[PDB]
Protein backbone atom coordinates (compact mmCIF):
# COMPACT_ATOMS: atom_id res chain seq x y z
CA UNK A 1 0.00 0.00 0.00
CA UNK A 2 2.89 2.37 0.75
CA UNK A 3 4.51 1.58 -2.61
CA UNK A 4 1.34 2.48 -4.51
CA UNK A 5 1.03 5.53 -2.29
CA UNK A 6 -2.34 4.17 -1.22
CA UNK A 7 -3.41 5.62 2.15
CA UNK A 8 -1.65 3.49 4.77
CA UNK A 9 -4.73 3.44 6.96
CA UNK A 10 -7.89 1.48 6.19
CA UNK A 11 -10.57 3.01 3.96
CA UNK A 12 -14.25 2.05 4.38
CA UNK A 13 -16.37 0.95 1.43
CA UNK A 14 -18.64 4.00 1.27
CA UNK A 15 -20.36 6.06 -1.43
CA UNK A 16 -20.63 9.54 0.06
CA UNK A 17 -22.88 10.83 -2.78
CA UNK A 18 -25.49 8.40 -1.44
CA UNK A 19 -24.76 9.52 2.13
CA UNK A 20 -25.06 13.23 1.34
CA UNK A 21 -28.49 12.37 -0.09
CA UNK A 22 -29.71 10.00 2.63
CA UNK A 23 -29.00 12.31 5.57
CA UNK A 24 -30.95 15.55 5.92
CA UNK A 25 -28.31 17.59 7.77
CA UNK A 26 -24.78 17.89 6.39
CA UNK A 27 -23.17 18.23 9.82
CA UNK A 28 -23.02 14.50 10.70
CA UNK A 29 -22.08 13.62 7.12
CA UNK A 30 -19.28 16.19 7.05
CA UNK A 31 -18.02 15.00 10.44
CA UNK A 32 -18.08 11.41 9.20
CA UNK A 33 -16.08 12.53 6.16
CA UNK A 34 -13.70 14.44 8.46
CA UNK A 35 -12.86 11.36 10.52
CA UNK A 36 -12.34 8.81 7.75
CA UNK A 37 -10.26 11.17 5.61
CA UNK A 38 -8.06 11.91 8.62
CA UNK A 39 -7.87 8.18 9.34
CA UNK A 40 -6.81 7.36 5.78
CA UNK A 41 -4.12 10.07 5.87
CA UNK A 42 -2.29 8.52 8.85
CA UNK A 43 0.01 5.51 9.18
CA UNK A 44 -1.27 3.14 11.89
CA UNK A 45 2.03 1.46 12.71
CA UNK A 46 4.54 1.30 15.55
CA UNK A 47 8.25 0.63 15.26
CA UNK A 48 8.38 -2.93 16.58
CA UNK A 49 12.15 -2.75 17.07
CA UNK A 50 11.35 -0.46 20.01
CA UNK A 51 8.48 -2.69 21.15
CA UNK A 52 10.74 -5.75 21.14
CA UNK A 53 13.23 -4.13 23.52
CA UNK B 1 34.07 -64.38 56.81
CA UNK B 2 30.86 -66.38 56.36
CA UNK B 3 27.72 -65.03 58.03
CA UNK B 4 27.72 -61.25 57.54
CA UNK B 5 28.82 -61.69 53.89
CA UNK B 6 25.96 -64.09 53.23
CA UNK B 7 23.38 -61.77 54.75
CA UNK B 8 24.76 -58.79 52.81
CA UNK B 9 24.49 -60.87 49.64
CA UNK B 10 20.89 -61.68 50.54
CA UNK B 11 20.19 -57.98 51.12
CA UNK B 12 21.59 -56.79 47.79
CA UNK B 13 18.61 -57.50 45.46
CA UNK B 14 15.89 -55.83 47.52
CA UNK B 15 18.01 -52.74 48.12
CA UNK B 16 18.84 -52.48 44.42
CA UNK B 17 15.16 -52.76 43.52
CA UNK B 18 14.12 -50.14 46.07
CA UNK B 19 16.81 -47.70 44.95
CA UNK B 20 15.76 -48.11 41.31
CA UNK B 21 12.16 -47.40 42.32
CA UNK B 22 13.32 -44.34 44.28
CA UNK B 23 15.21 -42.99 41.26
CA UNK B 24 12.14 -43.54 39.09
CA UNK B 25 10.09 -41.67 41.69
CA UNK B 26 12.53 -38.75 41.56
CA UNK B 27 12.30 -38.61 37.77
CA UNK B 28 8.50 -38.80 37.92
CA UNK B 29 8.38 -35.92 40.40
CA UNK B 30 10.72 -33.89 38.18
CA UNK B 31 8.44 -34.45 35.19
CA UNK B 32 5.21 -33.77 37.09
CA UNK B 33 6.34 -30.29 38.20
CA UNK B 34 6.76 -29.05 34.61
CA UNK B 35 3.99 -26.72 33.44
CA UNK B 36 3.96 -24.43 30.41
CA UNK B 37 3.24 -20.82 31.36
CA UNK B 38 1.03 -19.25 28.68
CA UNK B 39 1.06 -15.49 29.23
CA UNK B 40 -1.54 -12.96 28.07
CA UNK B 41 -0.46 -9.60 26.66
CA UNK B 42 -2.47 -6.44 26.07
CA UNK B 43 -4.15 -6.58 22.68
CA UNK B 44 -2.75 -3.98 20.29
CA UNK B 45 -6.24 -3.12 19.03
CA UNK B 46 -6.86 -1.09 22.19
CA UNK B 47 -3.54 0.69 21.63
CA UNK B 48 -4.65 1.54 18.09
CA UNK B 49 -8.00 2.76 19.42
CA UNK B 50 -6.27 4.99 21.98
CA UNK B 51 -4.05 6.38 19.22
CA UNK B 52 -7.12 7.26 17.17
CA UNK B 53 -8.77 8.99 20.13
CA UNK B 54 -5.63 11.04 20.82
CA UNK B 55 -5.84 12.29 17.23
CA UNK B 56 -9.28 13.79 18.12
CA UNK B 57 -10.88 11.73 15.33
Automatic annotation (TrEMBL), chain A:
Parent-record interval covered: 160 to 212 of 370
Biological source species: Trypanosoma brucei brucei (strain 927/4 GUTat10.1)
Record's protein name: Uncharacterized protein
UniProtKB/TrEMBL annotation, chain B:
Key words of the record: Membrane, Transmembrane, Transmembrane helix
Organismal lineage: Eukaryota, Discoba, Euglenozoa, Kinetoplastea, Metakinetoplastina
Full-length numbering of the shown residues: 58 to 114 of 114
Originating organism: Trypanosoma brucei brucei (strain 927/4 GUTat10.1)
Top-rank taxon, per record: Eukaryota
Name the UniProt record assigns to this protein: Uncharacterized protein
GO terms under cellular component: kinetoplast; mitochondrion
Amino acid sequence: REEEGLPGGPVPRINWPQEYSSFIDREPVVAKRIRYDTLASTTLERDEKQIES
Amino acid sequence: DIMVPSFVYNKLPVIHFLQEKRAEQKLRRVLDETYTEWTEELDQAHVTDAITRSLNI
